[PDB]
Amino acid sequence: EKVYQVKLKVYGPVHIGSGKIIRKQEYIYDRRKSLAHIVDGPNLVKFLNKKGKFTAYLQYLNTTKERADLYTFLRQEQIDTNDWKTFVLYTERVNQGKKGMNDLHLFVRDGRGDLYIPGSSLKGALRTVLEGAFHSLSISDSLPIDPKNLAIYQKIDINKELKPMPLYRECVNVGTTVEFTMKINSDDWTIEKIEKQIQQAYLQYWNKWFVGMVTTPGGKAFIKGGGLPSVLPTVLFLGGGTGFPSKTTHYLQKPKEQAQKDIFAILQRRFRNVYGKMATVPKNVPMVLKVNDSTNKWYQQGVCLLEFQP
Template identity: 25%
Template sequence: MINTEKWEHKTYELTCISPIHIGNGELLKQYEYIFTRDRNQQRIYFLDKTKWMTFLVRHDLIDDYAQRVFSGKINLRGWLQSQQIGSLSAIIREVCNASADVYLVREGQQRVNDISRQVKTPDGTPYIPGSTLKGAIRSAILFHDIRQHPEDYRPFWDPIKAAMEAGNRKQMRDLAQNIERQAFTRLKQYKNRPDDALQSVMKGLSVSDAMLIGHERDTVILQKYDVSAVRREGLNGHPLALFRECIPAGRKFRFSMTLDKDIARFIGITSLDDVWQWVRDYLAFGLAKEKAVFGHEYKGEFEESKLADIRLGGGTGFLSKTVYYALAPENEGRPMLAEFFDKVLFTRRSCHHHMTKDDRLTPRTLKLAWADSDRWILGLAEVEEVTPC
């Protein structure tokens, strides 16, 4: 029996309001998948690497395939059809282990480029790692502590400002670590072992992986689409040549959380309800900043975002930068972040000119997901407590 005075344990159901992409670190090139299209459907078929190599050996195609790959000129579907070794559908059944519908922003576009894969279990079921959930919660707790105790963090701002102006990456990393130590390193039972993990209040929160409810294991391939707010140019939407495998909107997952109240109280958390209120406040702050810039053009998307409790995964863009907005004095956050982006995060070659082009928000982009006529702010999810039977 759990000691409810010391521990709190709850189960939650997470519903994807919009598509969510949690990358597994794998980036597929055009020669690593088969892209098919007809009038009604565009689809990606993912190669089973073992079956694919067996297939190439059996048909004596390894040398030709390798030559095409190294030349950088290969359409895998067209190349397979040109070999005249059977129907494409039969080959797909033999060498592929999964597939996903593709949604292109530009009507009539013929190509898909690199695809960032979604994390999945060994049997191919998409899930949301507990580390992803806990990472988003951790950022929300940090944000909350800065907002509640600004005097504790005020001494960090001038050194951060100086590091941003100097473009000093190492100093920025060191200062970020010091800010996190200020927020989380509060347990003193290991005085002779100065280990941030051992002394962190985050030890008091456990989050399980969020596992899929139901049998719909399908994913979708969505093209990256950014809307930029550029000084004197207004809003400019543009698709990019990057594709993500995503969990579709509407999918449901279940996970659990356990809170050690004795540890959590060191940062002012008394219950899991506190945790979720802080997460919602953090999301609301970021969405409000974005809505002030993009809300007029994307009213429906921001209206739907009111249902969200958390934003997760790759491509969520602005939210992680709101910690700096919380830290900075009024009116200093955006210009300093612009300088930070131009001088620290990006080289001159990849500079996005935040200092000259941003006038209302840094970073100046809203990350959207498109699928046919549907459009969402990427990565939003609703979380509800599951009442025990």
């Protein structure tokens, strides 16, 4: 059995979810500083109990139920920044598409408390690309990710135009390198075979669907802002929110028109409130492209370039 070292080069922010979402009430958003202080609830509650501010917090939550940002409440009663750091877990960068944030999706962290990309998530992606029992393929969990490489991004849907939405997720910043250890057997899987299949899968993804978003005006703005990297090609959308083409082997295999019709049928079967109301197959299925930054560059969610080293 041969072994290799997988180098995941993050060209688009990657968010491996943890199953836990928080709201603007739970954490701190310094808009002027443009930083999101992720806090843990028990410490904040005990701090407010010690300071006697917990009743004020409950009243503030009651007053504006829909919008109850913690930062505005703490500014209301003038709580010191060090008092924040008492209960604040850690701060994160902010890249807001829209103002204040709405819903935050937390990254996956192990018991030791470090960020890491799980092996199973990489294995699933490589299985989606490689299918057509994967016991021979093995992916180790990633080496822990430095917290400096984590930042909050805002997801922008592009249905021929950019649209800010209440999507904010903790993602690995672009330019980050992630290390995995991969072991395969010579008989069943070949490293060259899987790399070639990754390349062909990305080529299909580009030809079948990506051009159908490039032609769009919002896609044109996405490209002009730098959303499409010059380099991107062993591309694999490892993260969550990459899109319907990603997470689905069938679109690449089916003829562009046949695949579009089948995807439209599936989406109408599942999501009747959006695609069910649509009478005909759109030019591109799915309709919207699946992220901006403080810099000039635009990004699409979850883009990665793999690099296997023996």
